[PDB]
Amino acid sequence: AKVFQWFGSNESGAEFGSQNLPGVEGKDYIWPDPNTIDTLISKGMNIFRVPFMMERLVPNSMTGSPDPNYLADLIATVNAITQKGAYAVVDPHNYGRYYNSIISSPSDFQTFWKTVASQFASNPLVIFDTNNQYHDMDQTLVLNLNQAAIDGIRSAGATSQYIFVEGNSWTGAWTWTNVNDNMKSLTDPSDKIIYEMHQFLDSDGSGTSATCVSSTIGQERITSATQWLRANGKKGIIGEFAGGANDVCETAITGMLDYMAQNTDVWTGAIWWAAGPWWGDYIFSMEPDNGIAYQQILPILTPYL
- Report resolution (Å) to 1 decimal: 1.3
- Listing DSSP states for 43-70 in one string gives TT--EEEEEE-HHHHS-S-TTSPPPHHH
Rounded to an integer, what distance in angstroms lies between the CA atom of residue 117 and that of residue 109?
A: 12
CB 143 within 8 A of CB 183: yes
User: 3-state DSSP call for residue 33?
Assistant: coil
Residues pairing with 200 in the sheet: 242
Cβ–Cβ < 8 Å for 258, 303: no
The domain limits of the chain are 1-305
Task: Report helix, strand or coil for 119.
Answer: coil
Asked whether 189 and 152 are in contact (CB, 8 A), the reply is: no
Which residue from 121, 140, 293 is spatially nearest to 190, judged by alpha carbons? Answer: 121
Q: Which of 158, 107, 101, 152 is nearest to 130 (CA)?
A: 152
Q: Are strands 6-11 and 97-98 parallel, antiparallel or unpaired?
A: unpaired
Angle between helices 68-83 and 34-42 (to 10 degrees): 20
* Exposure class string for 123-139: b at 16+ Cβ within 10 A, else e: bebbbbbbbbbbbebeb
Helix ranges (DSSP H) in 61-159: 68-83, 106-118, 139-155
User: Counting Cβ atoms within 10 Å, is residue 97 exposed (0-12), middle (13-18) or buried (19+)?
Assistant: middle
What secondary structure does DSSP assign to 204-263, as a single string?
A: TS-S--S--S-TTHHHHHTHHHHHHHHHTT--EEEEEEE--SSHHHHHHHHHHHHHHHT-
Q: How far apart are CA 301 and CA 138, in angstroms?
A: 37
Buried b (16+ CB within 10 A) or exposed e, 183-199: beebebeeebbbbbbbb
